[PDB]
């Protein structure tokens, strides 16, 4: 069924591809994911808009809005993408998670470091357990009878 | 996630020096009355608008406590309507049914190569 | 740590330094009911109850039957934003 | 469920290396082959629907 994708392909510009754009106001730029050819300009002609991406948001968590019924359809047509694009789509579950830099087999020291961090989090939990039994908003110390408030978050 | 990474923070009396303020009451000290309707629109409205429809922030996702996985039943969507009215008596025939797809002389389905209209969804 | 001068406070709540090319500021939020305007009272009545009203006309002019014996016909055209219990039954069964 | 499941991650690591190629290349080529299978699955599903 390659006949159905003929129009999409452009001889002058090139084959279709998926990338991002840079638009908005100076100082508050936001990424916009669209579909275009290879030689097309970064900000110009576009075939279809897939979504957007906001790496900086007031809440502090990166947002990502995408179309689940369009990305899968475009991939079947034979549309490539950059390395960075694959990583973001992998987390969403649309495509297999690509390997990180230097591969996975070399990730030897990180495995041990991650275990230490996980162990510390579990140990910290045990510490706070006892606190709830004798929670004291106001706790002094044997220095100058100074007041020290305690609050969780 | 906030409840998981819990910590004990000790706050002394001297750390709340800047928290206090002099004025008792508070209110808006600058009216929101726009001066230039066109100059402001093409400087702080158009660049920040990339969609042709007005969509509000969706509700948060609900997850379990023990297993920490998303649940099946959750809150529904939050559709928005202009002026409250949500009724159309003579809906037009939109072209969004077959995005980038048309019918050939043979009857088969073929694609197109055209720039989408920025105000396609804003012109019902 | 005690905050005495403004210099100490400035060097304690500021965000960590970042690169000059990457974006630093966030993206402001624009509500559907206010794009480039912020309505507010500018008169004597500056503090009073201002309830939101959502007009809702008839959904269909055809005569609908009673769902499980409970009538779901429209009685009056005046409807507030809050959903009435009678209407909540019809929408619940629709899904 | 296989490509999108946890089995895909461990499959890339268990691959035979070749002389003259970097460790990252072995996993990259293995991942590329997997990406070819998903395209056919989506294409078949879209046509059927």
């Amino acid at each position: 069924v390659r006949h159905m994708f003929l129009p999409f392909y452009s001889k002058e510009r090139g084959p279709p591809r998926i990338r991002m754009q840079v638009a908005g106001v100076k100082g508050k730029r936001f990424y916009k994911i669209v579909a275009a050819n290879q030689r097309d300009p970064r900000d110009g002609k576009h075939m279809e808009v897939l979504g957007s991406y906001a790496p900086c948001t007031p809440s502090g968590v990166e947002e990502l809005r995408l179309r689940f019924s369009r990305i899968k359809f475009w991939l079947a047509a034979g549309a490539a993408f950059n390395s960075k694009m694959g990583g973001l789509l992998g987390n969403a579950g649309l495509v297999p998670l690509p390997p990180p830099m230097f591969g996975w087999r070399t990730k030897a020291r990180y495995t041990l470091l991650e275990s230490v961090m996980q162990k510390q989090e579990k140990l910290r939990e045990n510490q706070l357990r006892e606190y709830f039994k004798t929670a004291e908003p106001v706790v002094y110390r044997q220095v100058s009878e100074d007041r020290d408030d305690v609050e969780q978050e | 996630w906030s409840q998981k990474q819990r910590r004990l923070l000790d706050v002394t009396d001297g750390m709340l020096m800047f928290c206090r303020k002099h004025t008792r009451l508070s209110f808006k000290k600058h009216h929101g009355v726009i001066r230039r309707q066109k100059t402001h629109y093409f400087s702080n409205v158009r660049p920040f608008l990339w969609r042709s429809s007005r969509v509000l922030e969706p509700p948060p996702l609900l997850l379990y406590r023990h297993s920490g996985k998303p649940a099946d039943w959750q809150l529904p969507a939050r559709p928005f309507y202009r002026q409250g009215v949500s009724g159309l008596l003579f809906p037009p025939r939109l072209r969004r049914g077959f995005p980038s797809m048309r019918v050939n002389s043979k009857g088969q389905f073929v694609g197109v190569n055209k720039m989408p209209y920025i105000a396609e969804k804003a012109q019902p | 740590v005690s905050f005495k001068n403004r210099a100490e406070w400035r060097a304690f709540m500021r965000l960590p330094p970042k690169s000059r090319v990457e974006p630093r500021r966030p993206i402001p939020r624009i509500f559907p009911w206010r794009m480039a305007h912020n309505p507010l009272p500018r008169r004597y009545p500056l503090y009073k109850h201002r309830t939101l009203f959502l007009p809702l006309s008839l959904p269909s002019y055809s005569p609908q039957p009673a769902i499980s014996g409970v009538a779901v016909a429209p009685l009056t055209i005046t409807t507030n934003a809050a959903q009435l219990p009678r209407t909540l039954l019809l929408q619940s069964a629709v899904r | 469920h296989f490509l999108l499941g946890p089995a895909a991650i461990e499959q890339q690591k268990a691959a035979k290396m070749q002389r003259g190629l970097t460790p990252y290349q072995t996993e990259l080529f293995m991942w590329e082959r997997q990406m070819r299978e998903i395209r056919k699955i989506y294409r078949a599903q879209y046509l059927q629907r």
Binding site: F68, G93 | P76, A77 | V94, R95 | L4
Partner: peptide, 23 residues
């Protein structure tokens, strides 16, 4: 039952919204 894949869960919401609008 017990849709674990992200794609399966994403499509579930689409059907629910369309069903409400259908009369």
């Amino acid at each position: 039952r017990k849709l674990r894949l992200h794609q399966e869960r994403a499509s579930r919401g689409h059907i629910e919204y369309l069903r409400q609008l259908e009369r």
